[PDB]
Symmetry: C4
Subunit: 388 residues, 4 copies
């Protein structure tokens, strides 16, 4: 096996097609399905799998009570076959913790899990299913990472971490790993003012991460990483098509180098594909809550502070709950370009549906097509009343 190199550009995105969906909450009403949240998708050279943070209980289990909570000793990064649900019997534990990322470099997979109390957390870096390196908290305030896949080039896999306040300036670092070992780390540079939960993808131009500004911004910060030089820059998506949640209404001028104001101390993990005229942004339909999901084609969104949509696709109706979203691609697929893909977490239960005492989710995932395909909408599909 050889390390994968990012030698291709993105395929032209003319629409999005259904890729995967697990219907986990529907099935978990009467099966041993683990409670999860913060899901993602990641490919190996021979298989693509669903990933998420388990809560160490099934949905119908009495221990599902209280699973709105983010950080417990009972969480772990698990993976399971594409579009199956995460069950007790089919889920493979990658590592133990409550914040994660994972990626295959072409030879083996690196997985990183952070665990610990708020003031004493630590990351453990696994490579080829063995622990290899560890990183202690540097700011003693909830060391945390991407919650979606990382990306590798010639064995080098950059990962974005943040330690510090969620409501003020924090200490963000970009780490560069190879075979699980730390080659280098850097402090965040550039004009992004707060960074959390980066969603990344790679192509010949380098690695592009679309993150969340939890502090002041409703536009999304972007980190652009050169995995060869092991350097990065940062800014915001310039476009006035704002993609955090909650968020203000779309203005006609966005902000390239500072947070667009209106909403403080909140946000949701999201993603974009920034590729000139082939640029597509994901966002919740609602400006107020994590409901609905749509893709918008916004030419030069990264660099054009006046850019508006010229095409779109609804993924989840506003009437249906969404949640986190992130990027991944099958870097080992045949062809001359990388096909952009994404997932949307469909959160069920608390806080929005409080007649149940649990919080979980299911997954829907799409990839791009060069055709202009008809659109459907893709709800979680579970009836909450059944769980009462």
């Amino acid at each position: 096996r050889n390390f994968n190199n990012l030698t291709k550009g993105l395929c032209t995105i003319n629409s999005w097609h259904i890729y995967g969906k697990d219907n986990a909450v529907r099935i978990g009403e009467s099966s041993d399905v683990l409670v999860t949240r913060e899901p993602y998708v990641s490919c190996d050279p021979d298989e693509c799998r669903f990933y998420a943070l388990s809560q160490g209980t099934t949905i119908r289990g009495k221990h599902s009570n209280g699973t709105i909570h983010d950080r417990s000793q009972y969480r772990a990064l698990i993976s399971w076959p594409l579009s199956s649900p995460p069950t007790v019997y089919n889920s493979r534990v990658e590592c133990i913790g409550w914040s994660s990322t994972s990626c295959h470099d072409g030879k083996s997979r690196m997985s990183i899990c952070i665990s610990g109390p708020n003031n004493n957390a630590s990351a453990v870096v696994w490579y080829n299913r063995r622990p290899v390196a560890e990183i202690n908290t540097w700011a003693r305030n909830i060391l945390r990472t991407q919650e979606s896949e990382c990306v590798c080039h010639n064995g080098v896999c950059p990962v974005v971490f943040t330690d510090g306040s969620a409501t003020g300036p924090a200490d963000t670092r970009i780490y560069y790993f190879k075979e699980g070992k730390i080659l280098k780390w850097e402090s965040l540079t550039g004009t992004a003012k707060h960074i959390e939960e980066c969603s990344c993808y790679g192509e010949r131009t380098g690695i592009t991460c679309t993150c969340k500004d939890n502090w002041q911004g409703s536009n999304r910060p972007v980190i652009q990483i050169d995995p060869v030089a092991m350097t990065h820059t940062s800014q915001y998506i310039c476009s006035p098509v704002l993609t955090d949640n909650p968020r203000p209404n779309d203005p006609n001028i966005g902000k390239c180098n500072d947070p667009y104001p209106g909403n403080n101390n909140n946000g949701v993990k999201g993603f974009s594909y920034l590729d000139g005229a082939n640029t597509w942004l994901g966002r919740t339909i609602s400006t107020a809550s994590r409901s609905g999901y749509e893709m918008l084609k916004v030419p030069n969104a990264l660099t054009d502070d006046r850019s508006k949509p010229i095409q779109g696709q609804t993924i989840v109706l506003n009437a249906d709950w969404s949640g986190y979203s992130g990027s991944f691609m099958d870097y080992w697929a045949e062809g001359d370009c990388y096909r952009a893909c994404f997932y949307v977490e469909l959160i069920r239960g608390r806080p929005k549906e409080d007649k149940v005492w649990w919080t979980s989710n299911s997954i829907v995932s799409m990839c791009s097509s060069t055709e202009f395909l008809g659109q459907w909408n893709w709800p979680d599909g579970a009836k909450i009343e059944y769980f009462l």
Copy 2:
């Protein structure tokens, strides 16, 4: 690995032997068995598997309520080990959608799933477990396909699609795929007047598909495909032994080039093996409903409008519910001929058994023997009262 070529003729069919049976509804009374419908069987070079469209819920699950419905966002093509039932924990998702086909070309498997609303559906073509090509609806009226396996020759895998009315003229296309890519498509030609749900098999003479005329016909249309020239012809089975359901009683003269009349706007997926004196037709025993199943040896049924049975075998008693049926063969078996096989879907629940709120099925499957074997009958075997 090499692409499989269709170099053999059919084995002589003197009777049918039991091949597989999953007892899914019996077992699902007290296990995590997925609700399915539209099952089939398909072989890889090293394994044969059961396939079906899941409904994204188990039978005992409360979400089984309403599963008579054909098209939802919660359906997917799944496969699972031969004669096991389709469980949450053993089922592998091939793709997402509510109409499907799948076949192995000798190197890798192609699977096709259609999803979407009635007026905006699309097919996604997967090859070696990755999405490769997509096809948008061309008539904006429930794009739909075989619901049983396709067949390949030297890498070329033809598939029959229909888009348009189920109760009038529609737009049927034959697509020719290789490694998931579209080589060519054609509009339906010949004398078949309506085409749905083709059941296909291959042998040295080419690929033969027995389909359903939903509009006016109770004889079955046939499409004969040359996978090298990538051309086809169509007509009906000439025989007065009528094999759709519901259907009129058998006359003494059938129809080769037009629907045999009496029943409109209905039908069931079915199959036949058309091989001169070695010809066998499958049909429900009842002329009114999807109950019973029998095989009849009808020499030259394809071309002889007077042909009658000279031998038969009961598969399912008229007292027991049947459903869809279709063809498959193990193209990678040893020997000098291809052994004809088929499955029968045994539908339980709605609409015929409405004391439960679900619709599902189990599977029975047979292959041919050159012996003249004794016959049994093969019911689903579940007691509906247990589910109340």
Copy 3:
């Protein structure tokens, strides 16, 4: 891979050690464990597995009601990992039917299942997981076979079948298969007067089968098969240590060439290892019912009509239910001799425990040791009251 040859003799048997036990009924009280009966064990070159006839329902499932019945359309030969229980999710279906045998020849496995009504049954012979040959009933009265593993030598795998009365003379045939194909069959010859449910093992001397005389005998008939010449002889175990069940008390003179009288129209599947001074016989402890199990060292039991035990080992206490027992060996183990092994079916439920409506079993299995090991006893271990 090469065909296995029977080149070794039996290891010296000085005691028996625990090999496997699945505790299926205990576990099935609260898990999705299939109802079974007629279990056995059989090895591949790289794995040994448990086998049995499923009843197509779990124990806790409502369809467990009525499973005392031997022959239904819902039965199948399944296999599952050594000492695991037969669950819905881990059981692999080998073929469909209600009487079976199975064996590996060193290259691939042959499995045979018989299905059908009493007067029209048929055997289907599978090889390398594909159907290869079929055999129709020859006496139209419950065609039936070993219910434990067959044995192979240089690709030739003999199997004993019986068709006809269980309470009078029947038509027994020995079939010789290679790669699933019929090389030859013979009618039973020799002095055995009735043959059912042969338990076989192989060693340099040939293949030895210990069977059951259901008609008149309480001594066990023996068939000795030369798999090279494809010929056989038959007689009874000469020893007055009688090993059928039910049975008369042990006399001081046994019978070599005729059934020992006292009990008609009954019996149980059993086994022995016949190896001169290294001879051990298995039997139920009770003379009246299928309870208890013991091994007795009876020198030259096959040929000495005065032979008595000189050593023994209790396997199951008389207070605990037993059932069928049979032989198998790991022909692919290291060393200079074949280690004799056996299983005992531990039947729970009907007819002996009729407060439940089901019949199932668990498995215990032992292999020989050259040490003189201490003995334990090995009950099924389930409490019937828990199922009420």
Copy 4:
């Protein structure tokens, strides 16, 4: 494949990081999780797995009643994927019995299980999943072994056994196996006065086992084994940091060659890493019961009868139940040193929590880091009230 040689020293231990945790009791509240106890962890060259003695029932199963009992015919050594729980459907049975050890030699795995009544127990030694050798009881009083992994060097795998009193002098033997065969055994020599449940690890210096003195000692006996010469020595950990449970308070002078007195006829399985200045000891926090767990860095604990801690890490709070603990390492990991690892059994149910009728456990496991990582605490996490 080659036999593994112990060519590396221990990595420098500066803290401990989370390695695995299965949350078995939480999950088993509503899943088919087997009741276990006496767990451990052991690596193959390509995978690390959890191990334990099943009780042959699930937790929610009615047969969980009475599982405080140590020795029944329904127990078996099972293994299952790292950090998954031990379920009916994912657990692989290694052998049958109520006391065990297991280790991989680089080519294949040896597993040993002891079964039988108290006065007639026997060990069966399995290698490459086949029974190879058997050992009868030599003192007729509960033949018993490590309950955690053994260690191998160049194919030789030493194992410590004890047969005889738990409350007085007993007969301890060290056996040396290769490919499952007995090369040699020795009677215990040295100054250890009672030996049970040894926890072992290997490094260039040889194999080191930290055991339990059940009779008189609250310091731990140590056996040091040379796997090449196949010889051993024994003594106690000299340190006054006492590590059995229950135990007296820590004095200022320990005992090197005799049991430290205060507590008789009790103890718990435990472990240590004895490596000069890199020495770390594990112990329960409580001196009275199996609650809490901590690691203490105690330089030269093995040889210095005045040695005290200079660093520590809490693993489980005193408020939470612990249990057995033992050592293992991934001998096939990359790098220049072996990373010390351990597990802690977290016992739930009887005798400490008697509102339920069962006894089971979950597992937490840690490995060493060269970083000084922040510490968390790792409870079982189940709420007993949910099981009522």
